[PDB]
């Protein structure tokens, strides 16, 4: 029912822009009940929350960065796009995009 | 095991120390004049600070602030009833009469670009009508109201308005949070007319949801509960209210509805019924009949027990009468010509709109003396300090000394600067505001029966 | 029951209550918690005061 795939540039250079695109099929994000986040992980370290955007066009970010991380969706194509500017050496990781609930309040 | 917690010094009723005499006095103003535009002020174009024609209508509060001559500056012929070394003199109110002499008839207003979408009473078919701008010309009557307030402190109001937001959260919708405030009621500011006691200046961007008179103002509303709960009670002596309204028509807004009504409550349609209209509806108050026996004026008001602890005694030699009327708020029209000719054409004339309003103040007072003694002077001093000053008999060292030295410097500010704080008493806290002032310092008299009130006052008092 | 000659006062604070008049705007993704609750003049106001 819910299918999920991402797409990114893959190889980036320092001080460039990061356009990570998330893609969904099975729902609509303007529906009252659907909501999506964005989670990173390195190959060796653990997990950490970065950004999450909801139905009514309001944004939260990870307050350690708080500046470069700008999350935005496109509900018409039913997609979310992740926009990081000035990618540094600390961003070497593997990103995971997925859908959240709030009756479970976690990533399904 | 428990305990009776804390003894607190209480306030007491003012009939404990205030003594009354058998000396009465009259006052009475002249007829007051007021005239202006019912919709907006007329600002001068060259200098945009001085007014040309002021804005006044029926629905603005007419707060009054009279002055009273200080009774201690009276040379009495027989000074035997009191000692000015031990006592002082101050006034107290016993009567009230407010007169209006305009004929009845309600006033009306409107707005030329009001956000009406469609009529929602018997017919609103599908699909939606095309357009990007559908503001229309509408005129609209108001709800009626009558009230009266008297007191020593000016009346304190309350209103809604934009306040503080919360922390950065992505789950709370873009909606301005609503916060309560407490305000002091100015003159000219408006009353509610069935649209909530909120500021419309900072909460409505389109400026197309109320009539034109109340788009950039704060339609305040008088508080009873907070004002009745003041322990000193020097704000509300005695008050009445009377109002009524009912619905006339029904209307909806127009635009991008900020929340989608949830799908759990309705089955969606198709064909001509694919899109959804608005859910933002709003009525219109119109008002009803206004009798002569629904009036609350041209009537005497004897007072013998106020609900608060102050029994009409007015410190500082000032009163505060606020009144709201709409029953004589009618609007005349003016028509002056440019040219005189024998055929009607629509550009030979010019129109101005005006509104008149008048008032009448009529009072009777009683003289009261205070035998100032050592156990009593501390009781007013915790209430106020200004009354103890302007009687001109003494001054106060505010502590009995301080307990900490607090380490005063002497070498005058060259190493570690601090708050120098140049003080000023500012001679009143009320000077920032603006009231319709009326003087009475040359309007006292002692012979009663040459005025309508004292003729009525002698019958009800039995003298 | 017998009666005495002692009286006592209780005074509540005022009660802020604000929201949507038409429905609950529930929190999304939950349908149990709420962003802003449904409150209107049409509903009952059931007060339960506890006494010392």
Cα–Cα nearest to B286, from B129, B141, B125, B463: B141
Which chains share 3+ C-beta pairs under 8 angstroms with C? A, B
Which chains share 3+ C-beta pairs under 8 angstroms with A? B, C
- Quote the minimal CA–CA distance from B171 to chain A in Å: 7
Hey, is C26 helix, strand or coil? strand
Spell out the SS3 assignment of chain B: CCCCCCCCCCCCCHHHCCEEEEEEEEEECCCEEEEEECCCCEECCCCCCCEEECECCCCECEEEEEECCCHHHCCCCCHHHCCCCCEEEEEEECCCEECCCCCCECCCEEEEEECCCCECCCCCCCCCCCCCCCCEEEEECCCEEEEEECCCCCCEEEEEEECCCCCCCCCCCCCCCEEEEEEECCCCCEECCCCCCEECCCCCCCCCCCCHHHCCCECEEECCHHHHCCCCCCCCCCCEEEEECCEEEEEECCCCCCCCCCHHHCCCCCCCCCCCCCCCEEEEECCCCCCCCCCCCCCCCCCCCCCCCCCCECHHHECCEEEECCCECCCEEEEEECCCCCCCCCCCEEEEEEEEEEECEEEEEEEEEEECCHHHHHHHHHHCCHHHHHCCCCCCCCCCCCCCCCCCCCCCCCCCCCCCCCCCCCCCCCCCCCCEEECCCCCEECCCCCCHHHHHHHHHHCC
Compare all CA atoms of chain A with the CA of B264 and give the residue at the minimum distance.
A32
Q: Tokens 């010094």 appear where?
A: B9
Q: Is C26 on the interface with A (CB under 8 A)?
A: yes
- Quote the minimal CA–CA distance from B42 to chain C in Å: 39
The structure tokens listed for B132 are 């990007």
Q: Is A67 on the interface with B (CB under 8 A)?
A: no
**What whole-number distance in Å separates Cα of residue B115 and Cα of residue A10?**
51
Q: Is B130 on the interface with C (CB under 8 A)?
A: no
B62-66 vs B436-438, strand pairing mode: parallel
Compare all CA atoms of chain A with the CA of C25 and give the residue at the minimum distance.
A32
Domain definitions of chain B by residue range: 18-461
**What whole-number distance in Å separates Cα of residue B313 and Cα of residue B94?**
9
Residues in chain C, overall count: 52
Q: In chain C, helix, strand, coil percent, each to 5?
A: 0, 15, 85
Compare all CA atoms of chain C with the CA of A99 and give the residue at the minimum distance.
C29
Q: Is B170 on the interface with A (CB under 8 A)?
A: yes
Q: Which DSSP symbol is given to A30?
A: T
The structure tokens listed for A50 are 């970065």
- Quote the minimal CA–CA distance from B440 to chain C in Å: 40
Q: Degrees (nearest 5) of the Cα angle B444, B99, B63? A: 80
Instruction: Indicate yes or no: CB of A56 within 8 angstroms of CB of B169.
Output: no
**What whole-number distance in Å separates Cα of residue B213 and Cα of residue B114?**
13
Q: Is A34 on the interface with C (CB under 8 A)?
A: yes
Q: Which of B168, B171, B262 sits opposite A54 (nearest CB)?
A: B171
Beta bridge mates, B183: B157
Instruction: Indicate yes or no: CB of A35 within 8 angstroms of CB of C29.
Output: yes
CB B68 within 8 A of CB B91: yes
Phi/psi of residue C9, each to 5°? -115, 145
Beta bridge mates, B93: B365
Hey, is C47 helix, strand or coil? coil
Cα–Cα nearest to B379, from B19, B86, B17, B85: B17
Residue B14 CB neighbour total at 10 angstroms: 19
Mutate to test the interface with B, among C6, C17, C19, C25 (most CBs of B within 10 A): C25
Beta bridge mates, A37: A52, A98
Instruction: Indicate yes or no: CB of C28 within 8 angstroms of CB of A103.
Output: no
**What whole-number distance in Å separates Cα of residue B58 and Cα of residue B356?**
9
**What whole-number distance in Å separates Cα of residue A46 and Cα of residue A65?**
18
Residue B73 CB neighbour total at 10 angstroms: 7
Compare all CA atoms of chain C with the CA of B169 and give the residue at the minimum distance.
C35
**What whole-number distance in Å separates Cα of residue A40 and Cα of residue A48?**
6
Instruction: Indicate yes or no: CB of C23 within 8 angstroms of CB of B279.
Output: no
**What whole-number distance in Å separates Cα of residue B9 and Cα of residue B66?**
33
CB A18 within 8 A of CB A85: yes
Q: Is A89 on the interface with C (CB under 8 A)?
A: no
Beta bridge mates, C20: C38
Chain A residues with CB under 8 Å of C26 CB are 32
Phi/psi of residue B376, each to 5°? -100, -35
**CA dihedral (B166, B168, B173, B174) positive or negative:** positive
Beta bridge mates, B35: B356
The structure tokens listed for B24 are 């009465």
Tell the burial category of B329 from Cβ atoms under 10 Å away from its Cβ (0-12, 13-18, 19+): buried
Window 235-294 of B: residues touching A by CB (8 A cutoff) are 260, 262-263
Compare all CA atoms of chain C with the CA of A35 and give the residue at the minimum distance.
C29
Phi/psi of residue A89, each to 5°? -75, -20
Residues with Cβ < 8 Å from B460, sequence gap 6 or more?
B300, B302
**What whole-number distance in Å separates Cα of residue B35 and Cα of residue B359?**
12
**What whole-number distance in Å separates Cα of residue B450 and Cα of residue C6?**
53
B153-165 core/surface letters (b: 16 or more CB in 10 A; e: else): bbbbbbbbbeeee
**What whole-number distance in Å separates Cα of residue B152 and Cα of residue B311?**
11
Number of alpha carbons in the 13 Å side-chain half-sphere of residue B443: 16
Residues with Cβ < 8 Å from B138, sequence gap 6 or more?
B110, B111, B114, B116
CB A97 within 8 A of CB A38: yes
Cα–Cα nearest to A80, from A15, A13, A33, A30: A30
Which chains share 3+ C-beta pairs under 8 angstroms with B? A, C
Residues with Cβ < 8 Å from B50, sequence gap 6 or more?
B44
**What whole-number distance in Å separates Cα of residue A45 and Cα of residue A39?**
13
**CA dihedral (B444, B450, B451, B456) positive or negative:** positive
- Quote the minimal CA–CA distance from C1 to chain B in Å: 25
Residue B313 CB neighbour total at 10 angstroms: 21
CB B367 within 8 A of CB B82: no
The structure tokens listed for B101 are 């002499």
The torsion angle over the Cα atoms of residues B290, B292, B297 and B298, rounded to 10 degrees, is 160
Instruction: Indicate yes or no: CB of B170 within 8 angstroms of CB of A32.
Output: no
Query: What are the C-alpha distances in Å from C47 to residues B50, B87, B259?
Result: 54, 52, 30
Instruction: Indicate yes or no: CB of B180 within 8 angstroms of CB of C16.
Output: yes
Q: Degrees (nearest 5) of the Cα angle A93, C28, A8? A: 25
**CA dihedral (B384, B386, B392, B395) positive or negative:** positive
**Cα maximum dimension of chain A:** 40
Hey, is A14 helix, strand or coil? coil
- Quote the minimal CA–CA distance from B326 to chain A in Å: 44
The structure tokens listed for C51 are 């006494």
Residue A97 CB neighbour total at 10 angstroms: 21
**What whole-number distance in Å separates Cα of residue B390 and Cα of residue B179?**
39
C8-19 core/surface letters (b: 16 or more CB in 10 A; e: else): eeeeeeeeeeeb
Instruction: Indicate yes or no: CB of C31 within 8 angstroms of CB of A33.
Output: yes
The reported resolution of this PDB entry, expressed in Å, is: 4.2
H-helix or E-strand spanning residue A41:
strand A35-41
Q: Degrees (nearest 5) of the Cα angle B195, B199, B204? A: 80
The structure tokens listed for B93 are 């109110």
Cα–Cα nearest to A73, from A34, A27, A29, A14: A29
Instruction: Indicate yes or no: CB of A32 within 8 angstroms of CB of B169.
Output: no
Phi/psi of residue B162, each to 5°? -70, 130
Tell the burial category of B193 from Cβ atoms under 10 Å away from its Cβ (0-12, 13-18, 19+): buried
Cα–Cα nearest to B20, from B93, B78, B83: B93
Q: Tokens 């109110």 appear where?
A: B93
Mutate to test the interface with C, among B3, B175, B280 (most CBs of C within 10 A): B175
Phi/psi of residue B324, each to 5°? -130, 120
Q: Tokens 């428990």 appear where?
A: B2
Instruction: Indicate yes or no: CB of C26 within 8 angstroms of CB of A32.
Output: yes
Cα–Cα nearest to A51, from A19, A83, A27, A74: A83
Chain B residues with CB under 8 Å of C36 CB are 175
Instruction: Indicate yes or no: CB of B172 within 8 angstroms of CB of C22.
Output: no
B97-98 vs B436-438, strand pairing mode: unpaired
Tell the burial category of B152 from Cβ atoms under 10 Å away from its Cβ (0-12, 13-18, 19+): buried
Q: In what order do the strands lie in the sheet with A59-61?
A: A59-61, A48-53, A35-41, A94-100
Q: Is A105 on the interface with C (CB under 8 A)?
A: yes
Q: Which of A55, A100, A102 sits opposite C33 (nearest CB)?
A: A102
- Quote the minimal CA–CA distance from C16 to chain B in Å: 9
Bond prior to B127 in cis (omega within 30° of 0): yes
Residues in chain A, overall count: 108
**What whole-number distance in Å separates Cα of residue A29 and Cα of residue A76?**
9
């Amino acid at each position: 029912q819910v299918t999920l795939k991402e797409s990114g540039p893959g190889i980036l250079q320092p001080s460039q822009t990061l356009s990570l695109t998330c893609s969904f099929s099975g729902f609509s994000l303007s529906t009252s009940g659907m909501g999506v986040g964005w989670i990173r992980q390195p190959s060796g370290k653990g997990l950490e929350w970065l950004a999450h955007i909801w139905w009514n066009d309001d944004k939260n970010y990870h307050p350690a960065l708080k500046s470069r991380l700008t999350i935005s969706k496109d509900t018409s194509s039913n997609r979310v796009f992740l926009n990081i500017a000035s990618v540094d050496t600390a961003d070497t990781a593997t990103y995971y995009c997925a859908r959240i609930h709030y009756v479970t309040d976690a990533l399904d | 095991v428990y305990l009776p917690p804390v003894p607190v010094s209480k306030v007491v009723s003012t009939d404990e120390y205030v003594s009354r005499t058998s000396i009465y006095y009259y006052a009475g103003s002249s007829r007051l004049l007021a005239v202006g535009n019912p919709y907006f002020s007329i600002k001068s174009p060259n200098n945009n600070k001085k007014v040309l024609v002021p804005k006044v209508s029926g629905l603005q509060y007419r707060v009054f602030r009279v002055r009273l001559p200080d009774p201690n500056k009276f040379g009495f012929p027989d000074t035997s009833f009191y000692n000015p070394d031990t006592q002082r003199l101050v006034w107290a109110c016993v009567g009230l009469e407010i007169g209006r002499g305009q004929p009845l008839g309600v006033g009306v207003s409107g707005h030329p670009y009001l956000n009406k979408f469609d009529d929602t009473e018997t017919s609103n078919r599908y699909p939606a009508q095309p357009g990007s701008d559908n503001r229309e010309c509408l005129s609209m009557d108001y709800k009626q109201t009558q009230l009266c307030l008297i007191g020593c402190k000016p009346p304190t109001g309350e209103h809604w308005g934009k306040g503080v937001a919360c922390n950065n959260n992505a789950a709370a919708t873009d909606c301005p949070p609503l916060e309560l405030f407490n305000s002091i009621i100015e003159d000219g500011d408006m009353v509610d007319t069935g649209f909530g006691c909120m500021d419309f200046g900072t909460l409505q961007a389109n400026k197309s949801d109320v009539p034109i008179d109340i788009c950039n103002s704060t339609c305040k509303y008088p508080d009873y509960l907070k004002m009745a709960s003041e322990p000193y009670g020097d704000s509300l002596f005695f008050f009445l209210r009377r109002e009524q309204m009912f619905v006339r028509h029904f209307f909806n807004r127009a635009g991008k509805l900020g929340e989608a009504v949830p799908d759990d409550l309705y089955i969606k349609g198709s064909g001509n019924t694919a899109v959804i209209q608005s859910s933002a509806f709003f009525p219109t108050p119109s008002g009803s009949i206004v009798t002569s026996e629904s009036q609350l004026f041209n009537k005497p008001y004897w007072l013998q027990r106020a609900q608060g602890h102050n029994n009409g005694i007015c410190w500082g030699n000032q009163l505060f009468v606020t009144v709201v009327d709409t029953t004589r708020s009618t609007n005349m029209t003016l028509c002056t010509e440019v040219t005189k000719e024998g055929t009607y054409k629509n550009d030979n004339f010019k129109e101005y709109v005006r509104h008149v309003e008048e008032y009448d103040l009529q009072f009777v007072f009683q003289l009261c003396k205070i035998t100032l003694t050592a156990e009593i002077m501390t009781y007013i001093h915790t209430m106020d300090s200004n009354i103890l000053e302007d009687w001109q008999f003494g001054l106060t060292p505010p502590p009995s000394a301080s307990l900490q030295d607090t380490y005063r410097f002497v070498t005058s500010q060259a190493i570690t600067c601090q708050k120098t704080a140049p003080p000023k008493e500012k001679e009143d806290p009320l000077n920032k505001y603006t009231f319709w002032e009326v003087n009475l310092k040359e309007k006292f008299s002692a012979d009663l029966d040459q005025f309508p009130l004292g003729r009525k006052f002698l019958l009800q008092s039995g003298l």
